Amino acid sequence: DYYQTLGLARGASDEEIKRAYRRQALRYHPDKNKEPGAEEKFKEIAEAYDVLSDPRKREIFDRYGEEVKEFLAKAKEDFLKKWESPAQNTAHLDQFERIKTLGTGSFGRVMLVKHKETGNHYAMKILDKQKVVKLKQIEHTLNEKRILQAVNFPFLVKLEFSFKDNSNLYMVMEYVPGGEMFSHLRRIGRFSEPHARFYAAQIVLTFEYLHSLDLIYRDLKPENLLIDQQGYIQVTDFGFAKRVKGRTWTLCGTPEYLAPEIILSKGYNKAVDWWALGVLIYEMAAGYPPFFADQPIQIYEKIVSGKVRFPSHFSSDLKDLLRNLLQVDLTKRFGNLKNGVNDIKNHKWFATTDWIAIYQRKVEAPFIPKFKGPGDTSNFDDYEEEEIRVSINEKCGKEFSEF
Amino acid sequence: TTYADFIASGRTGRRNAIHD
Numbered sequence: 001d002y003y004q005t006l007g008l009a010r011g012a013s014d015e016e017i018k019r020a021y022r023r024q025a026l027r028y029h030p031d032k033n034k035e036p037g038a039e040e041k042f043k044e045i046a047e048a049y050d051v052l053s054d055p056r057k058r059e060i061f062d063r064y065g066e067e068v069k070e071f072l073a074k075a076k077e078d079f080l081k082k083w084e085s086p087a088q089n090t091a092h093l094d095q096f097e098r099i100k101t102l103g104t105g106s107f108g109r110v111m112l113v114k115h116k117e118t119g120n121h122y123a124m125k126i127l128d129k130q131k132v133v134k135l136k137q138i139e140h141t142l143n144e145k146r147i148l149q150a151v152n153f154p155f156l157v158k159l160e161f162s163f164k165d166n167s168n169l170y171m172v173m174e175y176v177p178g179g180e181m182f183s184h185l186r187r188i189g190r191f192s193e194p195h196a197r198f199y200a201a202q203i204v205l206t207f208e209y210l211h212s213l214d215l216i217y218r219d220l221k222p223e224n225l226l227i228d229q230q231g232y233i234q235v236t237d238f239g240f241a242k243r244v245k246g247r248t249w250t251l252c253g254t255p256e257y258l259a260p261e262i263i264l265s266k267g268y269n270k271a272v273d274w275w276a277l278g279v280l281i282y283e284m285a286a287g288y289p290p291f292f293a294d295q296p297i298q299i300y301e302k303i304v305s306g307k308v309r310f311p312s313h314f315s316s317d318l319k320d321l322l323r324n325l326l327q328v329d330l331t332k333r334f335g336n337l338k339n340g341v342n343d344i345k346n347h348k349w350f351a352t353t354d355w356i357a358i359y360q361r362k363v364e365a366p367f368i369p370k371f372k373g374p375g376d377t378s379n380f381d382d383y384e385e386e387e388i389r390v391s392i393n394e395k396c397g398k399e400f401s402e403f
Numbered sequence: 404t405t406y407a408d409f410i411a412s413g414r415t416g417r418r419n420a421i422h423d
């Protein structure tokens with residue numbers, strides 16, 4: 001990326017390209033730098049000035065950025081339409097055959113189910129209204145439904161249907177048969193750097209999409225990333241997602257993945273998602289999270305402590321990227337600077353990353369889960385199968401009237 | 404190693420969320 005090479009802004013003046021070219025070429029001119037790599041950097045700087053100073057060459061190099069901007073502007077128009085008029089009551093419980101449980105939580109459970117007409121398989125998230133009111137998660141579960149129905153991105157699980165009855169709220173999502181990234185990661189031990197990087201790039205792209213909508217995800221962790229049949233991530237579990245234009249304050253999420261400013265009483269923004277990306281890349285490459293302890297407050301002390309220990313098998317580029325994502329100071333954290341996500345996409349650790357190809361899913365997955373049909377749930381763990389009770393009376397009607 | 408401390412800790416399981 002030529003602007004990064006020259007230390008420049010896309011909207012740079014012709015003059016500012018000329019001086020940045022003189023400024024950067026000096027720091028690598030053989031007369032002043034015979035260190036390893038000085039000569040290739042000197043070539044790259046000359047290349048950058050040549051593209052950026054020629055108006056025709058610059059106009060078409062600028063198309064990469066302009067296509068991203070156009071893609072995001074359209075994604076926003078589409079999102080805002082569904083955001084303003086959300087889908088409600090687009091199916092009914094009796095339309096589905098409940099198979100088995102695929103996962104659980106404080107709120108309820110996700111069940112493998114099959115549509116009785118079309119035979120299609122889905123994952124139905126069941127939430128008990130009373131429990132949700134009890135755990136004061138009303139707005140959170142309204143955020144989740146309204147956000148998941150309105151977004152559309154290759155690495156976000158699709159909400160297919162939603163509805164409620166007297167007792168429960170229901171979210172019927174696309175079924176992802178490959179299982180959680182958590183199981184595979186714990187089983188394999190750790191991913192190799194190019195393996196972690198393949199997943200990380202998909203997350204970077206998804207956060208770029210989500211933050212352009214002013215959405216904060218707030219629960220990045222391997223438990224929440226599903227592997228599809230071509231080995232690509234599907235993000236599920238939007239129970240802490242929120243639309244936030246300015247700042248927000250809630251202490252929620254998973255202790256291991258919380259940014260300092262979530263734990264601290266001050267408010268925070270979308271930058272907490274980039275901190276959690278740092279935690280995720282660390283856990284993926286190391287096999288364990290960088291802040292674990294028995295008590296949450298012990299985890300909180302390590303998080304705000306500003307100190308991180310890296311395994312020996314961590315490359316220099318990985319540690320340098322992780323130092324910038326796991327940056328306690330908000331004004332220094334990657335993702336949160338003037339250049340935003342581009343600082344992350346232009347980082348050396350990602351140098352081999354073909355972003356367009358990732359987005360198109362043209363890249364070969366380094367892991368494809370062992371499949372045996374559209375219902376071989378062996379990539380998921382087994383859970384106790386409780387039965388689904390629907391009361392004769394509507395519980396919490398008012399609290400959930402917009403669901 | 405820290406990875407050894409990780410599995411020597413029983414807490415290699417699914418992490419609970421918090422919502423204060």
Ligand SMILES: Cn1cncc1C1=CN(c2ncnc3[nH]cnc23)CCS1
Nearest residue numbers: 102103104110123173174175176236237
């Ligand atoms: C506990 N939980 C809270 N939100 C999501 C979950 C989970 C869902 N799982 C899914 N498995 C398959 N296809 C899916 N499609 C959408 N979700 C899933 C199982 C892991 S946990």
